[PDB]
Structure 1
Amino acid sequence: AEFVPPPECPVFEPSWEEFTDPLSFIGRIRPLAEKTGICKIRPPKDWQPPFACEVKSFRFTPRVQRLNELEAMTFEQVREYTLQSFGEMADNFKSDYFNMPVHMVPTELVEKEFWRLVSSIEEDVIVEYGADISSKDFGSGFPVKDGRRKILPEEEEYALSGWNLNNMPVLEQSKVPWLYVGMCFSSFCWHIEDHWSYSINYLHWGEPKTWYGVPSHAAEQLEEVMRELAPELFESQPDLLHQLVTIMNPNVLMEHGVPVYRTNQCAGEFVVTFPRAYHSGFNQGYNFAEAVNFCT
């Protein structure tokens, strides 16, 4: 059977008056976005933050990911890349897999093929991605007043903007942004954030990032479906460890009454996940994202 795309999550296009402050805006859209788990925010057209990462020194060792790892139970280790050398590998993989220029591959085709490969036992596809990349060690994608890099006058409005993820509040009453370097089919499984916190993700550039989200009111139903279909060796594991292998086709959740919403996060767009909103997804191609957990 072919993959059935879930319904689209809400997309918001705030004006310059509404793009004022993120927390104020997120609080106003909450009555709708909390009912879908995730939402997308498109900044005004002329809000274009410049990429501040030192690409001349950005070197990292990605990790290997096999799409049908869970179906194999029912050695692939890697080289150091630069941001450019990784992009050349990522584009070569996608163009060779689909036999067409990378920007010509439709997003619905990659989505259908991704979930086919996840459940396919007759074809093993291996991809790589950069995760667990702290902006404190590699530098943020947004301009910042750090004491280790120079910002221009044109960059100052973005270093001080409330939508700069380095300026989000991360202290709960009684933390730095992380980086993601993706390629086609690189994916993250279903999870919620620590302390059930909010999370905001900005796609600096590259090909889209496909999201799936579940509202918080269905969190227990997802976990029940997950426990009923997960392998017996992983069902008894704590959720912190179990969330490392909780890959599941969204149609499986939808067939059991779990509401799922999707979206294609494009370059220059924000995605916000609400408290206890399970989410997962995959990258359509070579891209660069930055994310942080914040609190209200």
Structure 2
Amino acid sequence: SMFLPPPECPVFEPSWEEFADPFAFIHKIRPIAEQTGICKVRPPPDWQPPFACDVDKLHFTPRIQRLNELEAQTRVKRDYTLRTFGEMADAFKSDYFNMPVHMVPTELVEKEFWRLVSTIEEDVTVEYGADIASKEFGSGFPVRDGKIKLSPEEEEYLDSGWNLNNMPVMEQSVLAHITADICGMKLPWLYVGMCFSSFCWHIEDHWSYSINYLHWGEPKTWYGVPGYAAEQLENVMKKLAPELFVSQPDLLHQLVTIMNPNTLMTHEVPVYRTNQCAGEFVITFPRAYHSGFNQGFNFAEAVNFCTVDWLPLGRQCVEHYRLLHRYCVFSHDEMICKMASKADVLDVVVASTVQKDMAIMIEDEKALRETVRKLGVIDSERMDFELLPDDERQCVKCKTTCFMSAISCSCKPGLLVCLHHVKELCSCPPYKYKLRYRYTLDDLYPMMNALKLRAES
């Protein structure tokens, strides 16, 4: 009546045989999980990564959070040790409820969360940790490094397919051979939670998957929306919180918010829930919106994840970013061309899928180049876009990261537009412009052919 819990998302309990290969497993469950946006995976009783840390030596700078529904927040930004954070967090929860922390029912914390965020009178603030691994606070999974002898148990999980440090560099990940600067998306993030600390509604950068593991502690409660309903959710957000939709200055500056899932469900957005317990994975699918909050003191690790299934969606995402004038994290076309340049060592299923995306890329590029030639741009020169800092190769109009080609004018030194925005660079006549291109079409067809040969093996 006050809060009606969404239906439970799918929960999978794979055998060791089914579990061992994450890419195969996710591909298998996709017909089901893509309809719910999120799903939970319980590893075989077998699989038990060791979790060891000195809570007095781990330390981090906490972020602070007000809990008001529809209030604007941002995803990116005092010091706690893991022990002193834990002490603060446990005391907060047990004081809030006047109960021992584990005797508080998960259903109650959930009901209470949605009450407190909806109430103007309440001004509850909480703290949390969120960062990539560092020397001050490393991964929860085993990683290789000298000077430290690992135990046989730790050694066992160094090369696990579900060790999140590994997933982005495995052979069926399309980011594996990517050498570009995208620290954000190949490195796991670490999240230290406390009761009610919350992650607002969002999808992943470039519509990637995310894989999320709860190492230890009280559960993390999730809400998820399938990819096919992303635009309906956004329309609801626009109607109820239009303040979130003003133009952001940077990539690091887009706005997100807390919103009751019942509100979404009332507006015909399908929503699913789950409580993720210690030792369980949650997987979010491409363009699947999700949000949630922590039941209490806990420690989670998450990583973006890009598969062959994701490739066409990645291209659509960048297109969508362009229409919104939103910054990219990386160049999709650069990733594709990098993989083509390494066709001889690519996984063959990867090669096959990349070949298909590349064919779409080349036909789109060919049409765009014909169009800008008809606008009177005649001069051209090869340009190694990958050498430019990312903030030095965005289209001045739509902020897309250029790689295949761009237009420049010596009138505006250093400025670029993508080929969709030739008319947005300056007032000079087009014959003063140069087409800057990474590859000729003659360079591109043999690259695509290499992929095709590799895929035929």
Q: Distance in 2 between matches of 1:164 and 1:83?
A: 22
2:286 equivalent in structure 1: 275
Q: Distance in 2 between matches of 1:274 and 1:7?
A: 18
Q: Contact 2:37 / 2:226 at 8 angstroms: preserved in 1?
A: yes
Matched, 1:64 2:64: yes
Matched, 1:235 2:245: yes
Which consecutive unaligned segments of at least 5 residues does structure 2 have?
Answer: 73-77, 179-185, 308-457
The root-mean-square deviation of aligned C-alpha atoms, in Å, is 1.9
State the 1:194 CA deviation.
0.6
State the 1:124 CA deviation.
1.1
2:95 equivalent in structure 1: 96
Greater CA drift, 257-266 or 48-57: 48-57
User: Superposed, which structure 2 residues align to 1:180-219 within 5 Å?
Assistant: 180-219=191-230
1:75 equivalent in structure 2: none
Structure 1 pair 237/230, CA: closer, same or farther in 2 (3 Å)? farther
2:159 equivalent in structure 1: 160
State the 1:242 CA deviation.
7.4
Higher fraction of helix:
2
1:234 is matched by which residue type in structure 2? L
Higher RCO (CA 8 Å, separation ≥ 6 residues): 1
Greater CA drift, 240-249 or 91-100: 240-249
- Bigger Rg, structure 1 or 2: 2
User: Superposed, which structure 2 residues align to 1:1-296 within 5 Å?
Assistant: 1-68=1-68, 70=70, 79-131=78-130, 133-137=131-135, 138-147=137-146, 149-169=148-168, 171-172=174-175, 175-231=186-242, 233-238=243-248, 244-296=255-307
Structure 1 pair 69/31, CA: closer, same or farther in 2 (3 Å)? closer
Q: Distance in 2 between matches of 1:207 and 1:246?
A: 23
Q: Distance in 1 between matches of 2:83 and 2:147?
A: 23
Please give the per-residue CA displacement for 1:14-40, whole angstroms capped at 9, x wherever unaligned. 111111111110000000001000000
Q: Contact 2:16 / 2:46 at 8 angstroms: preserved in 1?
A: no
Q: Contact 1:207 / 1:283 at 8 angstroms: preserved in 2?
A: yes
Q: Distance in 1 between matches of 2:235 and 2:252?
A: 17
**TM-score, structure 1 as length reference:** 0.92
2:397 equivalent in structure 1: none
Q: Distance in 1 between matches of 2:7 and 2:148?
A: 43
Q: Distance in 2 between matches of 1:280 and 1:8?
A: 14
Q: Distance in 1 between matches of 2:52 and 2:302?
A: 15
Structure 1 pair 69/17, CA: closer, same or farther in 2 (3 Å)? closer
State the 1:70 CA deviation.
4.6
State the 1:57 CA deviation.
2.0
State the 1:83 CA deviation.
0.6
1:110 is matched by which residue type in structure 2? V
Please give the per-residue CA displacement for 1:13-71, whole angstroms capped at 9, x wherever unaligned. 01111111111100000000010000000011131111255534211121111112756
Structure 1 pair 154/247, CA: closer, same or farther in 2 (3 Å)? same
Higher fraction of strand:
1
Q: What secondary structure does 1:169 align onto?
A: helix
Q: Contact 2:244 / 2:255 at 8 angstroms: preserved in 1?
A: no
Q: Percent identity, please.
A: 80
State the 1:234 CA deviation.
2.7
Please give the per-residue CA displacement for 1:235-291, whole angstroms capped at 9, x wherever unaligned. 233596675332211000000000000000000000000000000000000000000
State the 1:159 CA deviation.
1.0
Q: What secondary structure does 1:102 align onto?
A: coil
Q: Distance in 2 between matches of 1:55 and 1:93?
A: 19
Q: Contact 1:9 / 1:262 at 8 angstroms: preserved in 2?
A: yes
Q: Distance in 2 between matches of 1:29 and 1:243?
A: 32
Greater CA drift, 32-41 or 42-51: 42-51
* Alignment: residue pair count: 288
